[PDB]
Design an enzyme around this catalytic site. Structure first.
Site, PDB file in Angstrom:
ATOM      1  N   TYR A  49       0.874  -1.174   0.000  1.00  0.00           N
ATOM      2  CA  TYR A  49       0.000   0.000   0.000  1.00  0.00           C
ATOM      3  C   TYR A  49       0.901   1.210   0.000  1.00  0.00           C
ATOM      4  CZ  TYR A  49      -3.196   3.701   1.721  1.00  0.00           C
ATOM      5  OH  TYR A  49      -3.922   4.887   1.862  1.00  0.00           O
ATOM      6  N   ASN A  51       0.351   5.535  -0.679  1.00  0.00           N
ATOM      7  CA  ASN A  51       0.005   6.890  -1.139  1.00  0.00           C
ATOM      8  C   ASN A  51       1.322   7.488  -1.615  1.00  0.00           C
ATOM      9  OD1 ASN A  51      -2.885   6.808   0.015  1.00  0.00           O
ATOM     10  ND2 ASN A  51      -1.673   6.726   1.924  1.00  0.00           N
ATOM     11  N   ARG A  95     -10.918   9.007  -8.994  1.00  0.00           N
ATOM     12  CA  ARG A  95     -11.941   9.399  -8.040  1.00  0.00           C
ATOM     13  C   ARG A  95     -11.647  10.729  -7.305  1.00  0.00           C
ATOM     14  NH1 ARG A  95      -8.343   5.911  -5.387  1.00  0.00           N
ATOM     15  NH2 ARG A  95      -8.258   6.259  -3.105  1.00  0.00           N
ATOM     16  N   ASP A  97     -11.512  11.907  -3.128  1.00  0.00           N
ATOM     17  CA  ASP A  97     -11.621  11.612  -1.694  1.00  0.00           C
ATOM     18  C   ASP A  97     -11.938  12.860  -0.839  1.00  0.00           C
ATOM     19  OD1 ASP A  97     -10.925   9.117  -2.559  1.00  0.00           O
ATOM     20  OD2 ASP A  97      -9.126   8.882  -1.307  1.00  0.00           O
ATOM     21  N   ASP A 128      -2.245   5.071  -4.534  1.00  0.00           N
ATOM     22  CA  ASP A 128      -3.002   6.311  -4.715  1.00  0.00           C
ATOM     23  C   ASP A 128      -2.085   7.442  -5.204  1.00  0.00           C
ATOM     24  OD1 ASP A 128      -5.640   5.641  -4.146  1.00  0.00           O
ATOM     25  OD2 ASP A 128      -5.459   6.019  -1.957  1.00  0.00           O
TER      26      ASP A 128
END
Lengths: 145, 147
Positions: A49, A51, A95, A97, A128
């Site tokens: 993961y 960002n 998207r 957030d 992300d």
């Protein structure tokens, strides 16, 4: 939330066309729940993961530590997905957030494009992409500085 | 100058390559980025198009897109474009890449982690939107582009 000039109202592009797309769309509704316990069950033990303006987490354990840590100081109030696509075992979500910075109570619309890798219907990667600085100077929370 | 591939990059061999027609367009446009020619690049655009490096304002129509591209090539040179992942669905092409950028004012280089979306009808670009952390690049090459 804003639905941009460029975001097609062909509201699919925008819906899940594949089982993975449906998993990724599911995962992001869990995001607003704001608990890393519920989120981490979508991950494989061999996973990542990241960002991207911040350092990556590798493996299921590190991913949980990072997600939890985020929720210590922030909250997802909304995740809005304009475009969702997939080729080659990869899902892409363009998207927005809606984040409340907990320590300062302030909110912001982060424009974000994310990529998920799935493998036997488990997230083996999540990355992300966005501008960290414009999030920070808008909610007063320099997450790196 | 040379990018090494991150440990998270999918090992599916097709993920690396163009999987559809749209995708090879977008892949070739990526190489024309090293030509540092806004007039050459503006070719790939339908004229009701748009462009937006996302920490910066959007440019709509080819008018702005060519001019926006033109202003960036004033202080910047693309040295290389390494595309790890590329895929498509519902008319959009997504690339996960590393842009090897150089600031003409200072001479310094930084490899910028980009995820970009390209909207394609026509075989012509009608939207292009790069997502990446701008501050990281600025600090690295000492070229304030927003501040």
């Amino acid at each position: 939330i804003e639905q941009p000039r460029w975001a097609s109202k062909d509201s699919a592009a925008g819906a899940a066309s594949t089982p993975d797309e449906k998993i990724v769309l599911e995962f992001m509704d869990a995001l607003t729940s704001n608990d890393a316990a519920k989120l981490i069950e979508y991950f494989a033990e061999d996973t990542m993961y990241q960002n991207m303006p911040l350092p990556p987490a590798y493996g299921r354990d590190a991913v949980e530590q990072t997600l939890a840590g985020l929720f210590t100081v922030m909250s997802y109030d909304a995740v809005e997905t304009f475009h969702i696509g997939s080729s080659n075992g990869l899902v892409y979500t363009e998207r927005v957030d809606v984040l409340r910075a907990l320590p300062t109570g302030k909110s912001y619309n982060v424009s974000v494009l994310g990529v998920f890798q799935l493998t036997e219907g488990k997230i083996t990667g999540w990355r992300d992409y966005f501008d960290l600085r414009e999030f920070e100077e808008a909610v007063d929370l320099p997450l790196r500085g």
